[PDB]
Structures are given as structure tokens and as C-alpha cells.
Amino acid sequence: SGFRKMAFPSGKVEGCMVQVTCGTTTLNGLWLDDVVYCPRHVICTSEDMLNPNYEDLLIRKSNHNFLVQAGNVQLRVIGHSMQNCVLKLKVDTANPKTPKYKFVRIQPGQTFSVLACYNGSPSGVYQCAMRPNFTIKGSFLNGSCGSVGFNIDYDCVSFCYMHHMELPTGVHAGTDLEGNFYGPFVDRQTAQAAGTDTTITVNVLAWLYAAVINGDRWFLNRFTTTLNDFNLVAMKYNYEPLTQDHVDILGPLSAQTGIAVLDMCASLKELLQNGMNGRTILGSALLEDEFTPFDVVRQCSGVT
Amino acid sequence: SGFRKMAFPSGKVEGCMVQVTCGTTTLNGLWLDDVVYCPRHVICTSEDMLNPNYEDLLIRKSNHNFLVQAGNVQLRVIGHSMQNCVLKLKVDTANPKTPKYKFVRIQPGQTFSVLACYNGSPSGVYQCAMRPNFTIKGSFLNGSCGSVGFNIDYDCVSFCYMHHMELPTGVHAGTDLEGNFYGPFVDRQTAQAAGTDTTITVNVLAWLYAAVINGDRWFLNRFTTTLNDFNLVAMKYNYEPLTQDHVDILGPLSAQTGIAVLDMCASLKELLQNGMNGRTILGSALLEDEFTPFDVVRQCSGVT
Ligand SMILES: O[C@@H](Cc1cccc(Cl)c1)Cn1cncn1
Ligand SMILES: O[C@@H](Cc1cccc(Cl)c1)Cn1cncn1
């Protein structure tokens, strides 16, 4: 029992972190097989970041200008190429610590672990969700660029995020491992609008199921609702509309607890309309949306 | 910017996890050098756990009864001994993945990362505090015994906790790596009183400093207080009394923000007496006490 905001064990990812320096700029790179992936803005100076012409800036760079160090070991760069907003530096040595891995583009509302790094050195690991507006609310300081987000399925690391930028609002933006930004963001020092965000309804319901499993039941009521009625309330409170696909994904939790998904929706409707009345759920005084139904099942069954 | 409940990178600890089986019971062990540490209750059956005579149960066990497996590798046990509530199984092979490490007994109110494991396999990592009453509010299911808590200082892992038990209240209890329980707990299936818990005042103030650093400032007011006056409020609200030693540890945060410790205490006094008024601080709707002043500085400066 007990329910915590748990990150995946980061060991397999720590083994891939390297420091990449180009000119005056140092950030983090991900060394998988004989390729090092890093944000393309490693080739910029401060004057370049207003509106960088990345193609022109990269043309002034040669393989020997990219300094890649994996702690002690210096990697020899034998090729470089830009793919979207990432650079791929081919090195002459395959990383001996390369785990089984995939590159995946996660959907908004999905969660992942971030291994925050500085100068190629891991500093901490935390779990977070990709917001519906494609930002993440992380903990990143200057130098954290190139830190990655990931999930693990037994022995396979699915890398889903590489950190690029902090928006003037303090929220974070980055790309998949092919260098495509999540959301409308561009890698420029420019004020950029993040869309209107919403609360991830399916995750809040998954979390209410985790609360019932772990003994927090005070919010359960004698009511039920419909998808239509619940969605009117979700609309008023800036929650994502609930679909049958979300109800379907909650099936295992519904079956385990015996609480029909629409009955949990009526508990969620009452919490939205009434608040928590100074009480808590799993140590939180607000409705938590950073646990997916999969995260709840995984944690409640002890998956390794 | 951004502030998250961050755990240490778990890689160095994942390399030490093993599975230990004795009879019908399997739990986790920590393999450091040529010794495997695990909870002594690995030698019990369900009938034994009401009031185990550990000395007698261990006398029926030989080195060959302790099955230690590090994933694929089977360790040969050449010695066994009980120290307090832990067993030390001497093995014939030093763990090649043994990091630089120390065994430390942490103080109540200090924080650490837990690597939750099942059958010797890491499942997740989360940060938590040792409550003032020596319990931890973790996420542990049956089979998680032997999972450890730790901190890292550059390349040194200080192991501070080994998980043993879940109390009937759903809170968790364990020992230091010498097998001494934190708190009054015994390793028996018996209802056991945890002391009255309090909120870790110094940590809440550290967290209010992290909030000001990261842009959440709404709670700052035009007031100040004294240690005596603040401690009357801390008393009413079951907060730990604040001492000059706590004010001293907050010195760096006070210097960085320019907010005198007693002025932050007046903000904390007003939040205790008035609540949050439906607002949040660093994404929380309650006063967070799981970040020490050291954790706040480390996170706000990007220490690796
Ligand atoms: O925002 C980053 C620098 C930068 C500026 C503008 C655009 C880009 Cl792609 C990068 C630094 N940073 C990342 N997390 C916290 N700080
Ligand atoms: O409580 C543990 C079993 C047990 C019972 C009684 C005493 C002891 Cl020392 C061990 C199982 N467990 C640990 N975390 C979650 N579940």
C-alpha cells in the first residue's frame, strides 16, 4: 500500500548521458549505439538565439568542433547531421552501456520520467506528464538541455522527450528523439504561446481509483452520471472531455474495485463542484492528473 | 526554473539489488562488496511472523539455504550472520558494480530516495522524508522488503534505510543498514503504535523559499514574527518547534532571496491560520514538508 509519484529506475538512461560542447556552449547528449543525440542549439551563441539560421550555423562546424565526453572518455566524432531540432553526431565507438531502446512520440496526457542532467552528469529523476498543450512542468535550469524523458517496458527504454527550452512562463518545451517539437514551439528565444491547457480527466479518474485501492474512500458517493452530463462539468472546469476510449482504458481499475467508471465520474463531478472541503486524497489537496491508468495498475501490482 | 519532488538517479543502487530466497520467502537484498544485506524476516514463514524467535529460526538455516540471485548470476553464500534486524550473507564474489558507499543513520525530517524493488528487480524510484515519528509514507507492496533508501554525494551512496514492514495504518517502517529500526518498531506481525507525527517546519520554510525563487510569491506578506510567537502557532498546528539551528540551516536561502527567516515564518504563520484560499504553491494545495533546505539549494543550483 501507499501511492507515490514514482519515476522509472534511471540506471539504463544514466549510462547513455554525455556532455556535448560546441564553441562556448555545453549541454547534454544521449549516446545510443554509435550516435550521440543533442539539441541543435548547442551550435548557437547568445546572439544567435534571437532567430538562429541553424543551417548556416552548422555549416561553420566540422566534426572536430563537437566535443563529446562521457565522464572520463572522449568520443571521436566521425559525422554530424541535423534532423529537425536535433543533431546526430556519429561517433567511432558504440556505447557499451546502450540498453534495448526505441524512440517513441508520446501522446499528450501520457507520463514519463525525466533524468535531469547538467554537463552530462545526472542530477535527479522525476515523473511528469506531457500536458494536453504539449508543454511539461519540469525542473530544468540552464545547462539541462538535452536531458531526456523516457518510459521502460521490462528491459526496453522508450525515449520520448529531449529537453530544449524554458518558455518565458516557466513551463518547458522539447522534442521527440527525431527532433520534432511537441506543440507549436520553435527553438528561438522568442515569446511563444502555449495553447490553453486542460486537466487530464482519465488520469484524475485513474488516481481516484488508486485512492480507493489504497484506502482513501471519503469522496465516493451514492451518485452516478452519464458521459454527457459529466462532460458538461468537465467543460465548465477545463477538464478534457471523457470518451468511451478513456472509459475502456479504466476497465481494469473499474473491475478491480467494483466501482463502475460512470460512478467514479459522479465522485469526480462532486469534487469539481464542491472542492475537497479541506481534506486530502493520497496526500494531495488537489485533483492529481499525472498518473495514467497504466501507471496506477503498474504501481498497484508491483511491475519490475 | 520549476521545482519537482526529485529523486537521486538510482543507477548506482540498481547495480546492487539482488533477490534473496530462504525457504518459501523471497525478498530483496543489497549486494555491496562480498556481503548481501536483507531483512532478517526472509527466514520466517507466515506462522512465524506473529512472534518470531529469530535466533532459533536462523539456527535451522545453513549457508546453502540462502539463495541469492543477481538477475542471471547465482551467488555462492559462504557465511551468514544476523545483526539486529538484518542478515548479512557473505558471498564468494565481490559485486563488480559496488559503488563508493557509506551506511548512515538519518535523522527524522531528513529526506532520501527509495528504489522500490520486487524479486531483486527495480520497479521505481521516489523521494520521501523520514517522518518525525520515524515512519515513512512510501509505496510498498508485499515483496518490496529489502528495498533501500539512500542519498548520493557526488559518487558516494549513503544508504540510510532498508524496508521491513507495513504497519496496519498503511505507513512504512524499516531499519538503518545495521538492522536498527527507526522508531519503536519490531519486526513482528503485531499492531504497533507510531508516535504522534508533526509537520517538518524547517522543510516547509525551505519549500516556501523554493516557491519564491521559482516565481510563486503570493503568500509573502508585510509581517514579521519571532521564534517564540511562531512556535505558539507551530504548537497549535502540530508543526515541529523552530530552533536557531533550523534558522541557521535556512541562511543560504534567506541570503539568496533577501527574505529574512522570521519574515518567511510570518508568511507560514498566515498560511497556517488562513489556509491557501483555494490557491497553490509550486503545484501543491497544501504545505509541503518533504524538501530539506539542502534539497532546495541542490535543485535550485543544478548539483550533479
Ligand atoms: O531555455 C533554454 C535556452 C534556450 C532559449 C531559447 C530557445 C532554446 Cl531552444 C533554448 C535554457 N533552459 C532550458 N531549461 C531551462 N533553461
Ligand atoms: O509488512 C511486510 C510483511 C511483514 C509483516 C510483519 C512484520 C514484518 Cl518485519 C514484515 C510486507 N510489506 C512490506 N511493505 C508492504 N508490505
Swiss-Prot record, chains A, B:
Notes on activation and inhibition: Inhibited by pyridone-containing alpha-ketoamides compounds 13a and 13b. In turn, alpha-ketoamide 13b (tert-butyl (1-((S)-1-(((S)-4-(benzylamino)-3,4-dioxo-1-((S)-2-oxopyrrolidin-3-yl)butan-2-yl)amino)-3-cyclopropyl-1-oxopropan-2-yl)-2-oxo-1,2-dihydropyridin-3-yl)carbamate) inhibits SARS-CoV-2 replication in human lung cells. Inhibited ex vivo by michael acceptor inhibitor N3. Inhibited ex vivo by compound 11a and 11b.
Residues covered by the Peptidase C30 domain: 1-304
Ranges of the Cytoplasmic topological domain: 1-304
Subcellular location: Host cytoplasm; Host Golgi apparatus; Host nucleus
Active site: 41, 145
Catalyzed reactions: TSAVLQ-|-SGFRK-NH2 and SGVTFQ-|-GKFKK the two peptides corresponding to the two self-cleavage sites of the SARS 3C-like proteinase are the two most reactive peptide substrates. The enzyme exhibits a strong preference for substrates containing Gln at P1 position and Leu at P2 position
Superkingdom of source: Viruses
Effect of residue 90 to R: In strain: Beta/B.1.351
Positions of crosslink type Glycyl lysine isopeptide (Lys-Gly) (interchain with G-Cter in ubiquitin): 5, 90
Subunit structure of this chain's protein: 3CL-PRO exists as monomer and homodimer. Only the homodimer shows catalytic activity. Interacts with host FBXO22; this interaction promotes the proteasomal degradation of nsp5.
Function: Cleaves the C-terminus of replicase polyprotein at 11 sites. Recognizes substrates containing the core sequence [ILMVF]-Q-|-[SGACN]. Cleaves and inactivates human TRMT1, preventing tRNA guanine(26)-dimethylation of tRNAs. May cleave human NLRP1 in lung epithelial cells, thereby activating the NLRP1 inflammasome pathway. May cleave human GSDMD, triggering alternative GSDME-mediated epithelial cell death upon activation of the NLRP1 inflammasome, which may enhance the release interleukins 1B, 6, 16 and 18. Also able to bind an ADP-ribose-1''-phosphate (ADRP).
Protein name: 3C-like proteinase nsp5
Gene name for this UniProt entry: rep
Residues represented out of the complete protein: 3264 to 3567 of 7096
